[PDB]
Amino acid sequence: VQLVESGGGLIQPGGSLRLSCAASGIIVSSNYMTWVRQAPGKGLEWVSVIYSGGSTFYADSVKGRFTISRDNSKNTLYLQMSSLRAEDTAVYYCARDLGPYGMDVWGQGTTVTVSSASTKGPSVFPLAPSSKSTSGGTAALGCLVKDYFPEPVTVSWNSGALTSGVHTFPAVLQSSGLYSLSSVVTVPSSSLGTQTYICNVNHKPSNTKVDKKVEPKS
């Protein structure tokens, strides 16, 4: 008994997308079926339901744009998304509503990203260790992975040889719809003169791999 969700990716602002919820053990034709979305850190938002009789109710932020449908044959639940905007960029779930008994069966989610787009490789810049980043014989250095799209980016240090004291921060979305993140590492300041620190940056969507060495600037 599960709910498998699929059919979501990059869509332009204004286009349309259709999500699908393939049921198992549950008949979408005889339950209340639910769609909720969840933006990063902004929590659970209900979208719409289809009754076991055809009645479809919507959230006033999706009315006119989202349409629920149902295929008894393929036992699949669909959500048609239209006139999409950036505010719909979230993880979309299908659950089953049991009224006063809760929402017991949930799907896994499908990520839907809506953006002006232009898939783009990053520009890795070094965060140089200096006296402004040394204290107690431990220095801070890192890479700045700026102006890339879409996610994710994977960052390592010395091809996995250096893992202790590393912090790869979550990406942030800029005004220009492009992403930026940073990864740092804390090393003993004595080691600045002997060890070679190189950040390893991969961005599979654009097939970009960049190895950038970080040395203290004179």
Next chain:
Amino acid sequence: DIQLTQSPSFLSASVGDRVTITCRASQGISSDLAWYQQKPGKAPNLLIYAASTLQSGVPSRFSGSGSGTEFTLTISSLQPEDFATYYCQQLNSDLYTFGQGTKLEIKRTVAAPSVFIFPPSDEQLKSGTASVVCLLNNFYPREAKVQWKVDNALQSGNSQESVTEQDSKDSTYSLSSTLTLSKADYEKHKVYACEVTHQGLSSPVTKSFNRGE
């Protein structure tokens, strides 16, 4: 619509402790309240329906109680897998009202952050933009403010922060703030401070640099 306000947005505790999460209704939904638990990278899971009824499969350390406007979730003996986010939800609601959500964290003693700053690389200056990065390393709790100062002018636009998940080993937080300007703007000032206020720090710690060095 009723408004569900969920009391501790952020809550930190230790394994084996008893925690209580509160969900208040605006107008009185009797006992039609359900609790959910969302682990990082997973869908919500129903824990409690009808205010206090345990969903089949949920361990016994969870229990709900409430009727009317004030409800509470109680985890009897907090376990390592119980550290997640919890959502309360009105039942039989026309709009499916959820709550903001309560995040559960591992408790720790106060640890002041290690502040570092980073001037923009020459490569980035050739392109026309100038990013300035400030680092707050291994601190606790997550509460921490970062004010940028350009020639002691407090800056509010042009900034973006990003915290890490709590560490598996040290159970500490680290954030990174990126002040991004154009080369035409960055080259018209000298002092670039990063003033940080945190519980552990007695005085606000500032880490600066002049552009001419």
Next chain:
Amino acid sequence: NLCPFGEVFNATRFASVYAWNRKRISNCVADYSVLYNSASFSTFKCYGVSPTKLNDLCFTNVYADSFVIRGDEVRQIAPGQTGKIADYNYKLPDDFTGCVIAWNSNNLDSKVGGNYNYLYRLFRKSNLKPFERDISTEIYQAGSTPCNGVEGFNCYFPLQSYGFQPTNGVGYQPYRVVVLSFEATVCG
């Protein structure tokens, strides 16, 4: 004689919405102005004719349907509406030609700790025809497995119980409704 509205509107107990009570009214004179000049109704809307001008009118038969629902559900008692009440409990036709009358009954139908006598049909395979009345207690098969008169996962009792407590929000409190349908033995 006068039509027995007194035993319908001032009745001691009303029925559950899923088993709405119907009374046929015939062979009498009905003063409708004493009902609309009472001002003790939170909802009293007519689809088809004005109340002041239906006292000047006759009908072959007049039906009075009564039940108890949530305050938030007294919307659904109207032509062309959707929701758990209109879909699985009490449907009015698109071409409805009567009047819908409701009033708050929190003082009578809700008790501390909860009143659970009043029920509604939550699970149903398809929508009700207008003026259909379903009372079946067949266990509802929500999955691909036969339910077989025994409850459990995907096997649910179709009728759920209202929880009327006096502390509920207004829209969630019990409301008594009376639906007067007109279709010549009744006049004014």
